[PDB]
Ligand binder design. Sequence first.
Ligand SMILES: Cc1cccc(-c2[nH]c(CNc3ccccc3F)nc2-c2ccc3ncnn3c2)n1
Length: 298
Amino acid sequence: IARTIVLQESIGKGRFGEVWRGKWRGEEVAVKIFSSREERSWFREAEIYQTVMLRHENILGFIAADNKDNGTWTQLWLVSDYHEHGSLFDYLNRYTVTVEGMIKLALSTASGLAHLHMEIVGTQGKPAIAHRDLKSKNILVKKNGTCCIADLGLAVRHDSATDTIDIAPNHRVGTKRYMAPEVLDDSINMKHFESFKRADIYAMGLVFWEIARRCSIGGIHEDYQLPYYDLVPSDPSVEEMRKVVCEQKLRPNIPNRWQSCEALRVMAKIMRECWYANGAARLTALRIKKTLSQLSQQ
Ligand SMILES: Cc1cccc(-c2[nH]c(CNc3ccccc3F)nc2-c2ccc3ncnn3c2)n1
């Protein structure tokens, strides 16, 4: 693995470590590199990606975890598939999409989240998994115009037999802008795994809003914005978010334009039904997938 990979170009720094474009036997791969003092972050992400039966077309393709000693210090590596478009955030900043394109991005995202969330029962069993930091910067766009989900480092895994979670969750681990109301106000019951699934759904609703803005019909579309761009600072605090989302009870604005088009009407209805304050009221990822699959056929 690491011995035979050559780093070519720095992509960016995430929560911990740095992502690079590298070449393995001539083929582009992505490499996330951590220092020795970040071993816990590296290990936990490696552990999630090595979950039995995890691989899926809408989850980032994991190749290997490894160590590389350069002669002075040790680097801890994760290696994955490389996607030239990069993140959905980058993609939506650079491009507009068609109705077809929008549905493909939304459906693929929902399909990946439904797979994450779904327990697969059997001898080779997959636990249900919640992401805890879903956002457009953590979703990649493939050449074929579908998405796959990345940064599984903060994920939690469910044991169905006991209704327990594999780690002891801390409060408010993810990106503040995308935190669900119950995460912002700390009312979430973090002994209840379903609560983490429901919080992911709220975040996916925000991502859908980002996509729909860029859906261009007759040359008409909105400019790229992050959710709540109109209400909070860049790099918002929990308190700034809580005042908007919990107290004033605002959600991203749904433009009037989105009523002129069946696909955009279906997307807008999904968003509203991801954004309820009470997590139990929100749609499931499986139900969103079904709705978009049917829309995708019509
Ligand atoms: C497990 C693993 C290995 C290698 C990269 C990633 C990964 N982890 C994130 C998380 N997000 C992220 C990170 C840094 C900076 C900023 C961000 F938003 N992205 C990528 C990724 C993978 C493949 C790819 N191809 C083109 N870019 N690219 C990015 N994971």
